[PDB]
């Protein structure tokens, strides 16, 4: 008897839902009087499954109404922890621990990627005689990002970027950048939100109307 | 024996399919053979405690691996990474240690519209007209249903083409034009039938300077 993990690492996007698995030998059928499943992370209990039931009282405050153990999977020899709406606090080392005659644990590490991939934009005519426009790009993510404006002819341009803490998601940043430029209908520009360590670029295409 | 007969697998993910066999004592890997195939193409040939990767078919060159730490437990776990629609079919496993026996496992590949890209364009701030867009790929064809925070169905413009990335899939992009203000919430729902399946992104109208 030993627990096995088909996936050692999980990379999961902010706000989405994850299923992290642990597999254990089940020759015949589950004797739920003998079955225990314990999920935790950084010494905080997520799930304690005993005598066929989830002990939700011992569940840590953080995970209330978010985490649960898929029970259809238990019959197959698979203890699947599903957590919904992944925060940046859910980055950590997750211990899964099962006792069924023998008893053994495995580790699973989770990283939470919070990309600047929901990009909002605005294009305004500031002065139609000089055909000066104001382009704007906003997005949210973690950590801080810089905005990089480029034209269709690959010219870097000077934008004005304003980084604040997000009024939606406490831990994320709200990055808004503004480009003033002279241009005409159908010309194409790009704003590119750049995170670092490791580098990651998300880019939206603005079409001047 | 096989705990799971049927696997429903996501497109582009990893799958782990399992065949169990009796193991009273420990593994003499000179005596052990494991063979995995689908449609007479070899996926894995494991012999003398080593993967015989020259017999492997082109299709599975660096994708197919046998989880070696789970051989110790009496369970041959075929793992294939980056699942295409071509991986739908019937997989045979055979193992010979002392005795010999085979099991068949059916695999179906779902390609859900669960990676939804979004963007919000402020068209005219005077009227406060915004242009919300959602796009995704999947199979089969899916409709998009736009709804407001109080769940009224709104009129949209949806465009469906064959995907350029993977031509068997479809690209579904939908745009909604609506007069609205900062912090109002909208939903774009990718729906697909026989059987029904819903995936929805939540779009929040931003505060721009």
Author numbering:
A (entry chain B): 19 to 227
B (entry chain A): 22 to 230
What does the paper say about this structure?
The PD-1/PD-L1 immune checkpoint, which is one of the best characterized receptor ligands in immuno-oncology, involves PD-1 (programmed death protein 1, also known as CD279) and two known ligands PD-L1 (B7-H1; CD274) and PD-L2 (B7-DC; CD273). The binding of PD-1 to its PD-L1 ligand limits T-cell activity, thereby preventing excessive stimulation and maintaining immune tolerance to self-antigens. Here, we have screened and identified a specific high-affinity PD-L1 nanobody (single domain antibody), designated KN035, which shows strong antitumor activity comparable to that of durvalumab, a fully humanized antibody developed by AstraZeneca showing promising readouts in multiple phase III clinical trials.
The connecting loop linking strands C’ and D of PD-L1 has shifted ~7.5 Å, which is likely caused by crystal packing. Overall, these findings indicate that the binding surface of PD-L1 is relatively rigid. Furthermore, the sidechains of these residues in the KN035/PD-L1 complex largely adopt similar conformations as observed in the free form of PD-L1 structures solved here or previously published. The limited sidechain conformational change during complex formation likely consumes little free energy and favors tight binding.
